[PDB]
Structures are given as structure tokens and as C-alpha cells.
Amino acid sequence: NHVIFKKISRDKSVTIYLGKRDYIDHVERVEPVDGVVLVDPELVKGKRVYVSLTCAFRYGQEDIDVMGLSFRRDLYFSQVQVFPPVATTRLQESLIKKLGANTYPFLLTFPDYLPCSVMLQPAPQDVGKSCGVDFEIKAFATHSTDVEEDKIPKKSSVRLLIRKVQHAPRDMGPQPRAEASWQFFMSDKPLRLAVSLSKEIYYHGEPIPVTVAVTNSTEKTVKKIKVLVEQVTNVVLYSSDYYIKTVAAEEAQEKVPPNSSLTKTLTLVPLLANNRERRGIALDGKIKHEDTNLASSTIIKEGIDKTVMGILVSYQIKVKLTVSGLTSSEVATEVPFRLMHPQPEDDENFVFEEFARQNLK
Amino acid sequence: NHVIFKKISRDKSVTIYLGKRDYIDHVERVEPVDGVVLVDPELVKGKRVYVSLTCAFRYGQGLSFRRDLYFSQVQVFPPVGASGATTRLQESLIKKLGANTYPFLLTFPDYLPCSVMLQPAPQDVGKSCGVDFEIKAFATHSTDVEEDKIPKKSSVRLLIRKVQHAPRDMGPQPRAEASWQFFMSDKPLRLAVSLSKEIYYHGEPIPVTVAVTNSTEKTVKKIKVLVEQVTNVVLYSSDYYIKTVAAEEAQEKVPPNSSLTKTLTLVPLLANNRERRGIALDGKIKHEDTNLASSTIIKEGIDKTVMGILVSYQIKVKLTVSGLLGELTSSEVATEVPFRLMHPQPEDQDENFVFEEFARQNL
Amino acid sequence: NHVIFKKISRDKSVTIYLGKRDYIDHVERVEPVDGVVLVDPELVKGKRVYVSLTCAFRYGQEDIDVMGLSFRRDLYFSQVQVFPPVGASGATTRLQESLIKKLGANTYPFLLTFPDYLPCSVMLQPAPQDVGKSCGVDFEIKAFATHSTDVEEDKIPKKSSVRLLIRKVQHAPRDMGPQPRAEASWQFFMSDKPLRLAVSLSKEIYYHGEPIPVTVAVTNSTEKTVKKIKVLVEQVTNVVLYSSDYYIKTVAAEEAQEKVPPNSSLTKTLTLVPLLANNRERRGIALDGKIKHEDTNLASSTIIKEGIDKTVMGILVSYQIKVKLTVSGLLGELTSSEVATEVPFRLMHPQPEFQDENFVFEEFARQNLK
Amino acid sequence: NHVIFKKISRDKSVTIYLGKRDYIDHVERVEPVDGVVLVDPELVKGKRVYVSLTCAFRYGQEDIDVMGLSFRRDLYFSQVQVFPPVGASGATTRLQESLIKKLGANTYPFLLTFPDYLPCSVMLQPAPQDVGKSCGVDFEIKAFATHSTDVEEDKIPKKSSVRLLIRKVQHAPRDMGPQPRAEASWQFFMSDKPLRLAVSLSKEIYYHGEPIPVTVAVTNSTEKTVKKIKVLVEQVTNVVLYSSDYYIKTVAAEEAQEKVPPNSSLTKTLTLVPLLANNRERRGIALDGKIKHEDTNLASSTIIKEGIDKTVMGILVSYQIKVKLTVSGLLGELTSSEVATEVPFRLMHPQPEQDENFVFEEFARQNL
Numbered sequence A: 001n002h003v004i005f006k007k008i009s010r011d012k013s014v015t016i017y018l019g020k021r022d023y024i025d026h027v028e029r030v031e032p033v034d035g036v037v038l039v040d041p042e043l044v045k046g047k048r049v050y051v052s053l054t055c056a057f058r059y060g061q062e063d064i065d066v067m068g069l070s071f072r073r074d075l076y077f078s079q080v081q082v083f084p085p086v087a088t089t090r091l092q093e094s095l096i097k098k099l100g101a102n103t104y105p106f107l108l109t110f111p112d113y114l115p116c117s118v119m120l121q122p123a124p125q126d127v128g129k130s131c132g133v134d135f136e137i138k139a140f141a142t143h144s145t146d147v148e149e150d151k152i153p154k155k156s157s158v159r160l161l162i163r164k165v166q167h168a169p170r171d172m173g174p175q176p177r178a179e180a181s182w183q184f185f186m187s188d189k190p191l192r193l194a195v196s197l198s199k200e201i202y203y204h205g206e207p208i209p210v211t212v213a214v215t216n217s218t219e220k221t222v223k224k225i226k227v228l229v230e231q232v233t234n235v236v237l238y239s240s241d242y243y244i245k246t247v248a249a250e251e252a253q254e255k256v257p258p259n260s261s262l263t264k265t266l267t268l269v270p271l272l273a274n275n276r277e278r279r280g281i282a283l284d285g286k287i288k289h290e291d292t293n294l295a296s297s298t299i300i301k302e303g304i305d306k307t308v309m310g311i312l313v314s315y316q317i318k319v320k321l322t323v324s325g326l327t328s329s330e331v332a333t334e335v336p337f338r339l340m341h342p343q344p345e346d347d348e349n350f351v352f353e354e355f356a357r358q359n360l361k
Numbered sequence B: 001n002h003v004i005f006k007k008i009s010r011d012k013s014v015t016i017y018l019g020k021r022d023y024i025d026h027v028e029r030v031e032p033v034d035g036v037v038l039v040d041p042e043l044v045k046g047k048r049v050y051v052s053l054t055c056a057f058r059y060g061q062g063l064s065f066r067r068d069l070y071f072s073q074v075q076v077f078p079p080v081g082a083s084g085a086t087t088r089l090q091e092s093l094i095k096k097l098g099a100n101t102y103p104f105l106l107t108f109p110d111y112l113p114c115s116v117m118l119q120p121a122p123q124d125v126g127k128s129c130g131v132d133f134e135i136k137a138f139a140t141h142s143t144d145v146e147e148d149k150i151p152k153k154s155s156v157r158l159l160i161r162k163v164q165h166a167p168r169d170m171g172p173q174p175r176a177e178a179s180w181q182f183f184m185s186d187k188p189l190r191l192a193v194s195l196s197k198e199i200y201y202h203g204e205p206i207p208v209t210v211a212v213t214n215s216t217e218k219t220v221k222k223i224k225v226l227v228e229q230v231t232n233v234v235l236y237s238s239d240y241y242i243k244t245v246a247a248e249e250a251q252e253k254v255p256p257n258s259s260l261t262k263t264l265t266l267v268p269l270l271a272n273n274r275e276r277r278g279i280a281l282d283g284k285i286k287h288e289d290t291n292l293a294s295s296t297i298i299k300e301g302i303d304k305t306v307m308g309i310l311v312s313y314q315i316k317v318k319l320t321v322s323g324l325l326g327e328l329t330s331s332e333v334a335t336e337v338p339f340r341l342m343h344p345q346p347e348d349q350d351e352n353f354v355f356e357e358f359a360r361q362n363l
Numbered sequence C: 001n002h003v004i005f006k007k008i009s010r011d012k013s014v015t016i017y018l019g020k021r022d023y024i025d026h027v028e029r030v031e032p033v034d035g036v037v038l039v040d041p042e043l044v045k046g047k048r049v050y051v052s053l054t055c056a057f058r059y060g061q062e063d064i065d066v067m068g069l070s071f072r073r074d075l076y077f078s079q080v081q082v083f084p085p086v087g088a089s090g091a092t093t094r095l096q097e098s099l100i101k102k103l104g105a106n107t108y109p110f111l112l113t114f115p116d117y118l119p120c121s122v123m124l125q126p127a128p129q130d131v132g133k134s135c136g137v138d139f140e141i142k143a144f145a146t147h148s149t150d151v152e153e154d155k156i157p158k159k160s161s162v163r164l165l166i167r168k169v170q171h172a173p174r175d176m177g178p179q180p181r182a183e184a185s186w187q188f189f190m191s192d193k194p195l196r197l198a199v200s201l202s203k204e205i206y207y208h209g210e211p212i213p214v215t216v217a218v219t220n221s222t223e224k225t226v227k228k229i230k231v232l233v234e235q236v237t238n239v240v241l242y243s244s245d246y247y248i249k250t251v252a253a254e255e256a257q258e259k260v261p262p263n264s265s266l267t268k269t270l271t272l273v274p275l276l277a278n279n280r281e282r283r284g285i286a287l288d289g290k291i292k293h294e295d296t297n298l299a300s301s302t303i304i305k306e307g308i309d310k311t312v313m314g315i316l317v318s319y320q321i322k323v324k325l326t327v328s329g330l331l332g333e334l335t336s337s338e339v340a341t342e343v344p345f346r347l348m349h350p351q352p353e354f355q356d357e358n359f360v361f362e363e364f365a366r367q368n369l370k
Numbered sequence D: 001n002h003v004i005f006k007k008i009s010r011d012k013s014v015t016i017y018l019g020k021r022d023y024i025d026h027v028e029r030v031e032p033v034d035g036v037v038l039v040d041p042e043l044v045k046g047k048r049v050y051v052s053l054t055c056a057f058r059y060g061q062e063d064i065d066v067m068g069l070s071f072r073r074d075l076y077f078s079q080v081q082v083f084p085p086v087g088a089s090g091a092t093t094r095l096q097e098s099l100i101k102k103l104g105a106n107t108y109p110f111l112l113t114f115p116d117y118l119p120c121s122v123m124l125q126p127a128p129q130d131v132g133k134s135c136g137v138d139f140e141i142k143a144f145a146t147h148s149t150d151v152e153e154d155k156i157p158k159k160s161s162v163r164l165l166i167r168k169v170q171h172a173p174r175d176m177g178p179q180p181r182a183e184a185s186w187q188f189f190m191s192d193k194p195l196r197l198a199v200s201l202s203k204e205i206y207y208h209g210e211p212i213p214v215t216v217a218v219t220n221s222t223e224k225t226v227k228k229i230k231v232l233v234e235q236v237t238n239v240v241l242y243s244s245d246y247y248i249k250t251v252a253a254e255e256a257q258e259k260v261p262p263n264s265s266l267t268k269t270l271t272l273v274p275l276l277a278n279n280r281e282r283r284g285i286a287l288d289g290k291i292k293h294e295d296t297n298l299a300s301s302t303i304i305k306e307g308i309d310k311t312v313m314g315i316l317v318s319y320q321i322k323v324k325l326t327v328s329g330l331l332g333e334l335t336s337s338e339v340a341t342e343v344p345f346r347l348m349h350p351q352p353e354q355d356e357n358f359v360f361e362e363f364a365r366q367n368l
């Protein structure tokens, strides 16, 4: 029972059908956009219909009594002709049969040098504005003299904001633990902190087992041990904005007294659900939408300038130790890991729905 | 030479006189409705006459949805207390009309919208809606212990306007900056837009200064500047209208690696629009004194929904760029700058009165 | 039980009484000098007695014999007549009324006011290492008798005079500056990675003897170790009359025990108390009095009033917290410089606030050390 | 004859002597720093004296009741030993041999070389209107003495040290090809009628103080009038470390008298000289030194070497000729249109080229 997503132009001349809202990037390759356009042949007589895939970085938000700063960089544009008709997929063949002889297929492919769906709406505390990377599928009709005035009439056009979602690659090597250790000399006596994760890549919703090994050879007491998942966001187009937000936290009970050692494994789950405040954090969609999650770790390909990703998103485990004096001192350290969606999957019956995404309560 | 507006009940028992058709809202306060009722003392014997001010939102062409936003009522007959006029207009009208003339004062609060209404075009989904202001003078009587009655024939209703005039304050000089980097181009196209001020008056020309800095290898073929009216119905139905009420297409092109500064002047006017449907007006399409609706001014700590219809204006600047549309984009290169549109600031022996029917002139 | 300070002239003809040795400047206004002069009416017969308030900057040693050894700039002079009694002659303040009653009918009041454009008690005696000489701002209260001779020359004998070196002490205003904060970062030669130092104090004004909590946040993203974190209170002294002398001296230092290893951060609060007591060597530092005296402290921060030329302050005194980070494999290898930042703060004394009082009398001369 | 620049440590134990304040970068190579250190052998007994060359980018300024934001990136560090005399600078120069003879046997030579990947002396103090802070690239020559346990306590005592802020000045290379005119043209269609603007400079590289002849050729085939022709030298400054600050300032301007009426053409040559002297306001512009100093000029054009990331230059400085044409409104308007175009050029100092007689001066630079 395959759910198909449809949207219709104002003038009802062009209707677009997609198999998915979300298209999978699994590093090796990206799932292409295969869909169909249903034209009203009366309302398209002597007209040409195209479908475009645009990836664009945007920066700026509407503020009263504040100068309107807007900025757009297109990171990819591609366009094909659907009408008049110029290999097909099985989804297209099936949709054409179900919809009629006014149905025409399109295939738009993604390249390997694009980011995934990342966007950010700032909090009151934050300097810097709303920014994001959008993916638009737009089907539109041109007239014969419309190309001659360079005009693309709105009522004959339909646009869909699809997501490019980061999944893990399908074949992966065995995963080395993500582990570091530090020796904090205090009065020439070492306080040793070792932090270790089970693996390097975790999935959204998957629990992260953080093993913390405090070896205290000092005459000071470790009063408190806090473990965070921090999300680090670097806007690398237009404005060098920096965000660092806790998306999961555990403050253990333990003290580590002088000349003793303590090993402890806390489990954290970095989830958007944990965060009442959904602003100041990199998401893969709008705050209002239900299917919106935390942004996956940016995966910069070799010999690609990171600036063309628009927004860099990374995750790290932060361990804060509160150490006594005779006011106390805090030491902290970071262990990086990557967060993304699971590996992808190794007649018909179509139910049709509006593309518009569901909201929250 | 003060023109006074009069209307008489069917039964000629109640006649209402107003100084104005239109009452000024200038944000700080709203001009109250000061008028007089002339009763035929024979035809109101043993009867009570009241005057009411009702503000209501309506939606539909039978009668589909009504929300009352304000109601107030006073007694004119028999005379309440002192019964002496409050304003000079009343004192003067009482003297000119006779001892059967009785004053009324109905005040506006600060939480109401101004006269806004909308009749949709064929292309538009959603129905006729508006905010009406009714001044109604009517007589009540009793022929039974069990009920009072309000005959229609003893009543007279006037549809006044609450017109938005400018405050003392103005917002900061509105300015926008936008830049685009098109696919495979290392070079930005920069658009800066500036207006002289934040508040313009109906009929006043709007000087839109446009600064196109073209560092690209493409040509800016066209620069179009619009005044767009944005209408949001915020009661019953979330209807949205966006209509051009003024447009100017500059002659200049901006070639590669050049910049052009240019000031286009627009005047957003109802007169510019043959099609008077699909746009927020301050009155009915048929009436002569009807204009474009003024910008809604929502007061602090007032829920916008009680305004019924939100009206805003913006300058839109569209750049048509060579060899993208089809090749490198399916989108439009445009930015918006908001501004407010309303009527000018207010100006801050006896008179000579000419009397006219309240009914408004047509086209 | 109010202690009153008295000094008597050599010839015992003029005795001066003050409520205080030290008079409070709290920025808004300055405490005036209210005192009384007790004359021996036999020894002042046909004579006039005056009291003067002089503020003067000096540079050099004190003039000896006839030699001008010193450079002197008078910053303020005022004088009043105490004898014979001027007009009403009745006390102005309660301290005067009370002293007159206790001492007798040969007691006469004086009031000398301070203006708003003067510095506070600041002086400096240089160390061997220092170039530049002894300098200071003195405040002299001098009561003296004049008489006339047969030739029309008036005389002012030293034996008929008494001079007191009072202090003008800086107490805090009502206002305080914003919480002082600094941020510094370094990227060393051949390093892609910053070393970030953030420094914060609890407040902008501290009092003499009050502990200063210096919060230090070292974020070390480098592959080098922060071997040492040293926190100083530095006193910066600028002589702005006669000679452009400059002194910068540590008056408090704390060396934290913690190191900050590669790819770690450390937040830490060290407490310092800038005190003259901490300094064995009392030379090369701005004091509010002489080294030998007990009640002598560090000079308060100079507070220059708006539209007053700083040169008329004579000696400018300021304080700052300096944080020095010692980083492994730099000094000699990647830098010949120091990794440090400064945060300014002001140091001064705390804010100010039917029967007679009970008076104990003491010599004005200040106590010394042991 | 030869003026030598000297500075002495507080404790008079170390004195440094340099041939120049300013060392020439002419793209091919950079003039090395050859000098001598005069030690007081009593005050350096059992001590080691070094001389370092540091190039550092700095960002931030002291503001009252404002948080102190400071940032330093070292772009080059090098150090040699002068005392005791175990030879480090290798072979000697004639300037050193001569200074050693004139000063005595307590004089020791040092040679510190510049690499090819450094910027030249550039710094900037912002104006009120400007958003970002003071920044610059400094070049420090520092001679300092260490004790035997000073290296062990990581301490460099200030009184035993002397630091000089030298300049790295951008001169033109010695061999250059013949110079093509720097010329562009634009066609501004107005109502489908072209307004043609051609701008031409004599050459691509000009020297500080050299006049720039800007030839402007307006061919007006439109029905509009060119009311005004303004020609500027604009300095464009991009801070490319810590903060992406941008400055664009006029350092020379000429507003011609001429109008160009409909269906006519006008050629005209204005001469501009971009000079710091022209600018009362010395803030918001890239200089090669401090505002207060006399020998301070406008910063030379940054010259980015092949395969060098521009970010390691710290501050990018470029110059351009801007031509603004004011074109009339047509049928009785109350505002006219401005079109403008830029022509880039580079600004720098001219190409470079027995016992001497030495006069000694304090290194400290003269003021205004």
C-alpha cells in the first residue's frame, strides 16, 4: 500500500506526484527524484511544462523596525521537460497507468557535493539570523512568448520542499570505539579522565553508552561528573555564526575521593523531543512539522570546500568534572561522534495525500 | 459652512443628525460620535429613544457569520440628566433645530480595527467579509405589561466609517538588502531598496530608491517595482489576498560588472485598479468616497483576531536576470520592504449648517 | 568616645584641634576640614591667627637650608582668619560647638572646604631599580600667627605656626562600573588551533583588604600544555607633572596548581588581596602616606572628573588583574613574547554613611611600624 | 652618511642596531634583517642573548565599560643566538663588519630572513561609522637576554629586552613586462538605446604619490543627459582573520564640470593621486603604520603568491578607479539615476635598485 504525495497548481493545469517527501543520501550515492506530472491538456495547449530540482542556502528573517538582510546561494539547479513528451522507473509506469494518458514522467538526480536538509531558527540569546538549506521540486508551465519575456507564471507552477536525509552507508567496516584520555596534573599529581563510546556512528533515537573512567591520584575530590551530548553548528556562508547546544545531559551522583578511581557508563539519547526550546538547534526541517528531527552530522566529501555545505553540523560527548579546592574548579573534555539515520534497505495499490507535512500538539 | 448629515425614520418620529460620515482614529485616541436626535414629540409620547454604536465583523453575502467587536448604547429621550449639549456642534444644532432636539455622545475604544471590507474576484476562493460601524437611533414602547417592542419604522441606522489617520510617531526609514549567488557563479547580484519614510498617505507619491550592484556575468534585463496589498482575514476563515495596487517598470538594464541606482515613484490608488474586487477597501465598491484600506495598526497586548481583517502594504522589487530563467533557476529574484499607508495627521461665533442625506455618492 | 588630634606651636601661642587625620573624598563631594584653634590670649595680643589648606604636588627631596631641591605645583590654596574672631564667631559644626565648650573661650572655629578637582593622597619613593625620584601630593593644614613691626613689614614666625599633613582618602561613590570581563585567544606559529583565555571579576570596585575573586576560563584546543596560570594584581603609576615617570608593580600574585592539557578546558577562581603588607619592599609603589607610618596603605585608584585635565592630579594610579599562561614548547621555539591579558578594576575605601561627645586628646603625629 | 637606528634595554645590558626601519618586499625575494647587538659583557656574564623576528596578526582595541576582546595569530617566528658568539646567522654582511669595527669587540651580528608567504605592513583603526575593531600585521625585531634558569622557569625579563616594530614595505618587482592599459567598457541600454562608458588607465601598477590618468569616454546615444561625471580612487579592505570586516573608502575624488547631452559623446582625462595627506580622517583606511607617525602611508595592494591561502595575509588591501555617471530623468522628474563601474589597479612603492660613515638615531618614528 504505497502512499503517493500530490500537489496541484492554482490554475489546475499542472499536478505533481512524488513517491516520497524525503530522499535518502547514503554517502556512496543519493536516491534520485522519480515522479510524474498530470497536465490538463486543454490548459497546456501550445505550452511547455518543466520540472526543476533546486538546492539553495538562505540567510535572513523578517524583523520589524530592523533592516531586511536576505541572502541566497543556489548550490545546485537542474531542469527537465515533461510536456510535450521528450529509461523509466516502475513507480512511474504504475502511476501513468493509474492516472491516465495525460501523465508524464520526470527523473531529477542529486550530485555528491551537496549538504543534507539543515536549517536553524535562532533563540533570543543567539546573535545571527534564520538560515537553512532547502530542496525545491518545482513543476511549472511556460507560454511560447513567456520564454521571450523571461516570465514563469505562478498560477501554472507547483513547488514541493522535499528533504535530503543523511543515512549511513550500506557496507561499513567494523567500528573502532570513539575514545580519548586526558591527564590533568594538579600539584604535580595526575587526575586521569578516559572517555569511551561503543562506536563512532550512532543513529537518531539510538542510545549512546558513554563509559567514563576517572583515576584520581590527586589530594582533591571529584565532587561532580556531568556528561552532555553537545550539537555544534557552524554557518559557513554569508555569516560565521556559531551555536553549541546541549541536546542530552546526565549528572551522575558519584564523587571520586583522593587516591581512588571510578568507572561508570551513562546512556544518553540525543533527541529533539528532549528539547522544549527547539530554537538555536540545527534541525532537518521546520520547528512546527512533526517529522522534523535533529540535523545529521555533516559529511564533507574529500576535495569539497566545506563552505558549499552552507551549515556544518557536528556532535560530541562533553564530560565536565567538578574538582574540590580549600570555590572549586571545573575541567571539561570532548569526544566527537557522528549522528545520522540507519543504513538503507538492501502488483501495486496507491493512496494519494497532500504533500503538506503534519504539525504537533 | 458646516455640512450636517441627516436621516429620518420611515414613520418620521426619529431623525438623526451627525457632523461627519467618517470619524478619525489617530492611534492615540479616536474621535467620538457627537450628534443629535430630533423627535416628533406626538409620535414618541410614552416612548423611549436610544442611540447605539455597533462594530461587527461579517463573513458571507443568507447571513453567514457575525462577530460583534463593540456595542454601546445611550438614551436620548426622555432627556437624561442635565440634557444640555456636551460639544459645540450639539449646542449649535439644538439652537438651529428646536427644543425637540436631544444630544448623544458615543465613544470608540482603542482595541477596534478601522473600516475594512473585501468583495472577492472570480479567481479568489473565500467570500465577502468586512468590519461595519453602525450608528442606530430607535424608539421602544410598551402596549402590554409582558413585553417592550422596537418597531423598524421608528428606527434609523447610519453606516459610518472609522478612518485611520497617522499618529505623531513614524517608524524608522524602511530599508532592505538582498543578494543572490546563482548556480556555478562565484559573483553576487546585490539589491538594496530604500523608501524616504515609513508612513505614506493615500494619494502621496512613494519614492522607491533601488541600488542594483551586478558583479555577475549576467544582465539585469528588467527592474519592476510594485506596491503589494497583503490582506489576512483572521476571523471565521484564514483567507489570504496579495494584490498589486501600483506597478512601475524602469527603462534601464544593469549590464555585467556594473551598478545602477534609480528612484521610481509609485502612488497606490483604488483609481489605478479597474477591477475593484479582491482588494481591501474602507467602504463599498459602488461608493465614490471609498479608498484602499489603511494599514491595520494592532495595539500592544490586543489579540490580532479581534481586528477581523489585517491589511498591510509592502514595496516589491523584481529583477529579471538574463540566462537564468530556464537555465539556472525556476524562481523569481525579488525582495520586499514594508511600509504603512493611512490618511494624513489631524489638524489639532456659531456655524452655518447645510443639511444633506447621509447616503454616500456613487460613480 | 571621639579621639581628637591636637598639635601645639613651639612658642605655645597657637594649638590646632582636628576631628580626624583623614578626610573622606566619595566623588560626589569631599568631607570639609572642621577644627578649632586654641590661642594663648597673652601671646597673640595685637596678632592675627590664620588657618590654611594647601594641596601641592612635589618632586625630589624636601628643600634643605636655602637650597630649592624640589619642584612644587600648588593644586589648591585656601585660608581663613580664626583670631581676632570674624563676625558671628559661633561654631558651624557640632564637633566645633562641643570642642569650644570643653576647651574654653580662647577656642575659635575654622572650616576649610575641598573642591572636586583635586587628587587624593598619593606618594611614591623609588626603589634602586627605578629611574625617577620621590614625588607625592601632600595636604597641609597650617595654623600660624602674623604680627606687624615698627617698619611696615608683617612677620610670620615658624615658632607661632603648627602644620598638619592630613590625608584626602578615596572612598567609593554610589555608582559602580559594569562587571569587568576580558577575552583573549592566540594561534601560535604553525598551529591551526586557538588557546582561549576568558577572565571575569565579581564587580568593578573592590575595597582595600577585600578579596578579589578572579574567575579564569582556559579553553586549550592546542596540542601544547598550559604548564602554569599566574594571576597578578598590577599597580600602574603615571607621574603626569614635571617628569613622565612610569611604574608597574605586582602588589599580589597567585600561581594556580592546575595545568591545562591539550584539547581540554579549565574554569578556576583564584582569590587575591592587594595589600601593602604583602610587599616587604614598600618602595616603587604608590601609597597614600609615608613608608614609615602604620596607617599607610596602597594608593586608591585615581578618579579623574569630567573636563578636568589629568595633569592637575599629579600622579595617576590604576589597578588591573593580569593573567599569564605559561605554554609548553613556546618560549625560544615559537615566541619571544608572553601569553597574558589584563582586566581593569578600581581599588578604594568602602562607601561612607541631645548630649555632647566625650573627647580624648592625642598628638597628630602618626604611629610607625615594628 | 648611513643613518643607523639604535635602541637600548632598560638595564643597559643589550643594545640593538639596524641599518633600516623599513625592509623591502619586491615579490621575488624580501630584504633580510642584518643588524648587530652591543652587550655590556659584565651584565650578560653567564647569560645567553637571542634576536627574534615575529610577524603577527592582531585584532581588538581598549574600550571603557566594553568587554576586552583580543586575538593574536603569529604568521612567522624565527630566532638566532648573538651571545655567546656561536655563529648562527652564517656569513656576515658589510654593514655588520663596519658596525662591529666602529662599536667595539662587544658587538655581535644577527641575520633574520623573511619568507615569501607573509603579508606586508598593513593596519587599520576604525572610524565611528565602522562596525569592527582595530587590527593589523606587525613585524617585531626583539633582542633579549635569558639567565641559565630563566629558560628552566620559562621567563624573559623585560629590562634585559629591546623590541623594534619594523615595517615590511611592498615595492614593485625589478623585472616587469611592458604594461597593458587597464581599460574596460560597459553599454547601459536605457529604453533600448545604449549609453556607452569606456574607462582606461595608462598602466596596471602605480606608485604611491604617482598621478593616475583616468581617461573616461561617454558615448550617449540615449534621449537622457549625463548631468555629472565623478571619478574616485576607492581602497577596498577585507580583514580575513578572526572577523570578516569590510571597508571601502574614497582616498581621491574628482567631479568634472561636463554634461553629455542626448546623441553626443565626450572623452575626458582626470588625474587623481591617492594619498593619506588628502584624508583629514585617517581612520577607516588601511595604512602601513600608525596614524600618529609621519612616515605612515596608505597600505600597498596585497600581492597573494600562487598556492598561498589569502587568509594568512590577515588583511587584504586592493585599489580601484570608480566612475559614477549621473543620468537625467526624462519627462520632468524630481530624481535622476546613477550608473557606476570599477577598474582595478595595484598601488605599491617603486622598483628597488668601502667603509661607511655612521650617524646614530633612536628607532622611535617621528610624529606630525
Ligand SMILES: O=P(O)(O)CP(=O)(O)O[C@@H]1[C@@H](OP(=O)(O)O)[C@H](OP(=O)(O)CP(=O)(O)O)[C@H](OP(=O)(O)O)[C@H](OP(=O)(O)O)[C@H]1OP(=O)(O)O
Residues within 6 Å of the ligand: A161, A286, A356, A357
Ligand atoms: O510548512 P507547511 O508548508 O507544511 C504549512 P503552510 O501551508 O502554512 O506553509 C506556508 C507555505 O504554503 P504552501 O503549503 O507551500 O502552499 C508558503 O508557501 P507558498 O504560499 O506555497 C509560496 P511563498 O513562499 O509564499 O511565495 C510559505 O512557505 P515557506 O517559504 O515558509 O516554505 C509560508 O511561509 P511564511 O509565510 O511563514 O514565510 C508557509 O507558512 P507556515 O509554514 O509558516 O505556516
Ligand SMILES: O=P(O)(O)CP(=O)(O)O[C@@H]1[C@@H](OP(=O)(O)O)[C@H](OP(=O)(O)CP(=O)(O)O)[C@H](OP(=O)(O)O)[C@H](OP(=O)(O)O)[C@H]1OP(=O)(O)O
Residues within 6 Å of the ligand: B156, B157, B158, B159, B160, B358, B359, B360
Ligand atoms: O446604508 P446606510 O443605512 O448607512 C445609508 P443609506 O440610506 O444609503 O442606506 C440604504 C439602506 O437603507 P436602510 O438600511 O433601510 O436604512 C437600504 O436598505 P434596504 O433596501 O431597506 C435593506 P436593509 O435595511 O439594509 O436591511 C439599502 O441597503 P443595502 O442594499 O446597501 O444593504 C441601500 O442600498 P441599495 O438600495 O442602493 O442597494 C442603502 O444605500 P447605499 O448607501 O448602500 O446605496
Ligand SMILES: O=P(O)(O)CP(=O)(O)O[C@@H]1[C@@H](OP(=O)(O)O)[C@H](OP(=O)(O)CP(=O)(O)O)[C@H](OP(=O)(O)O)[C@H](OP(=O)(O)O)[C@H]1OP(=O)(O)O
Residues within 6 Å of the ligand: A151, A153, A154, A155, B123, B224, B242, B243, B244, B318
Ligand atoms: O493573482 P493576481 O491577480 O494577484 C496575479 P495575475 O495573474 O493577475 O498576474 C499576472 C502578472 O504576473 P503575476 O502573476 O502577478 O506574477 C503578469 O505580469 P508580467 O507582465 O507577465 C511579468 P510579472 O509576473 O509581473 O513579473 C501579467 O500582468 P502584469 O503584472 O504585467 O500587470 C499577467 O497578465 P497578462 O498580460 O499575461 O494577461 C497577470 O495575469 P492576469 O492579468 O492575466 O490575471
Ligand SMILES: O=P(O)(O)CP(=O)(O)O[C@@H]1[C@@H](OP(=O)(O)O)[C@H](OP(=O)(O)CP(=O)(O)O)[C@H](OP(=O)(O)O)[C@H](OP(=O)(O)O)[C@H]1OP(=O)(O)O
Residues within 6 Å of the ligand: C129, C248, C249, C250, C253, D153, D155, D156, D157, D158, D159
Ligand atoms: O615587567 P614586569 O614587572 O611585568 C615583570 P619582570 O621581569 O620585571 O618581573 C620579575 C618577575 O617576573 P613576572 O612578574 O612573572 O613577569 C619574576 O617572577 P618569575 O619569573 O615568575 C619568578 P617566580 O617563580 O614567580 O617567583 C620575579 O618576581 P616575583 O617572583 O617576585 O613575582 C622578579 O623578581 P626577583 O624576585 O626574581 O628578583 C621580577 O623582577 P623585578 O621587576 O622585581 O626586577
Ligand SMILES: O=P(O)(O)CP(=O)(O)O[C@@H]1[C@H](OP(=O)(O)O)[C@H](OP(=O)(O)CP(=O)(O)O)[C@H](OP(=O)(O)O)[C@H](OP(=O)(O)O)[C@H]1OP(=O)(O)O
Residues within 6 Å of the ligand: D158, D163, D165, D363, D364, D365
Ligand atoms: O611607539 P614608539 O616606540 O615609536 C614611541 P614610544 O616611546 O612612546 O612607545 C610606546 C611604548 O613603546 P616601547 O616598548 O617603550 O618602545 C609602549 O610600550 P609598552 O606598552 O610599555 C611595551 P610592552 O608592553 O612591555 O611590550 C607602547 O608600545 P607598542 O604599543 O608600540 O608595543 C606604546 O604603544 P601603545 O600602547 O600606545 O599602542 C608605544 O607608543 P605610544 O603610543 O605610547 O607613542
